[PDB]
Design a binder for this molecule. Sequence first.
Ligand SMILES: *[C@@H]1O[C@H](CO)[C@@H](O[C@@H]2O[C@H](CO)[C@@H](O)[C@H](O)[C@H]2NC(C)=O)[C@H](O)[C@H]1NC(C)=O
Ligand SMILES: C[C@H]1CN(C2CCN(c3cc(Cl)ccn3)CC2)[C@@H](Cc2ccc(Cl)cc2)CO1
Length: 362
Amino acid sequence: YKLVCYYTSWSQYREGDGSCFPDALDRFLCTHIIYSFANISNDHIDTWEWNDVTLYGMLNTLKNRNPNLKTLLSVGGWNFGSQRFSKIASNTQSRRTFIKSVPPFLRTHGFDGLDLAWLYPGRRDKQHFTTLIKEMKAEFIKEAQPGKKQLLLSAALSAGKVTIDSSYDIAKISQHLDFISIMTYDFHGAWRGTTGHHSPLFRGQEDASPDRFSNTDYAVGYMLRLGAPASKLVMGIPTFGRSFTLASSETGVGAPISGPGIPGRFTKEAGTLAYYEICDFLRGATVHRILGQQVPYATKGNQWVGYDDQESVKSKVQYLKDRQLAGAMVWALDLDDFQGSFCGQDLRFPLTNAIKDALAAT
Ligand SMILES: *[C@@H]1O[C@H](CO)[C@@H](O[C@@H]2O[C@H](CO)[C@@H](O)[C@H](O)[C@H]2NC(C)=O)[C@H](O)[C@H]1NC(C)=O
Ligand SMILES: C[C@H]1CN(C2CCN(c3cc(Cl)ccn3)CC2)[C@@H](Cc2ccc(Cl)cc2)CO1
């Protein structure tokens, strides 16, 4: 199995114990660590943060004592400008300048591959996305062709049925990608105005949600049916929760809300919490395992958060092993309890170690 784990470069700026640099990462935890994100500037791949070159080095030094560890650089992101990617991918000359810029940059900076994070191609970009992936892989084969270790090409793909149908030619891109990470979280399965879990494993109660699509199992089965080989499909597991402010005394799934949850102290983003912030939240909270969805929510006062814990990520690993998938993907290492100081067990990376342990289990 693969355990593909993201590190985000803006996590260095979080206050106090929230600050995360690559030298806090456990070199033996994951098989692949992906650094997010690189820019595209003047149609060339390029750095984003002022100190990316320093942080690239802190990450790649982890391979010194773990020669099996691979690193990739993820280009794009969700505040990149899909308009910007679209223009780069449709223009024949821009696309070639970008492809040609990628292997020198990865070799210069010590990376083993590129992860494409175009979030998200439009219906009008579906074929451009295929062409981009085909031509990028072709350049990687050419660059290695004299006995080099070939660079890896991965892509992070939406788990949302509407985006999958509009944006991706799954069967074609799967032939060229070394692996696909399906982003099986941030689902919006609840009726408008109500709570729901953003990463359920299955639909659960049939008469309680609008659609059958907003869950991990539907997305995985669908992408396999569309032609992604199981041996290339890496299943996303979040180390963050999505939260809501409750509008009444009701606290179950589908309870009325007035808006997103109160921001966490470190991540400062209403509607989201890192897992270590959730560990803090859990003191005084009530935890419920959602029947049929195989994941917990916690509620306290007027707050409600749907998240994954050690038990639920082991169930998700059992699921992916039953489906013979390639492994698990984790967003993100800096949202796990990487310090080991919040989740009361003294253990660093509690959620990602739980995933690692389940993948290794027999
Ligand atoms: C990422 O690259 C883009 C594209 O070059 C940069 O966007 C430019 O930024 C300058 C400085 O703010 C602006 O004056 C230009 O108008 C922008 N150009 C475009 C096409 O948007 C962006 O600054 C880069 N981001 C980084 C390095 O963090
Ligand atoms: C607007 C949504 C965006 N979503 C991202 C999750 C991560 N995902 C990727 C992207 C790639 Cl390339 C690869 C894997 N996953 C892209 C979407 C969450 C961000 C988040 C914010 C705050 C906190 Cl505390 C935790 C997570 C919640 O918000």
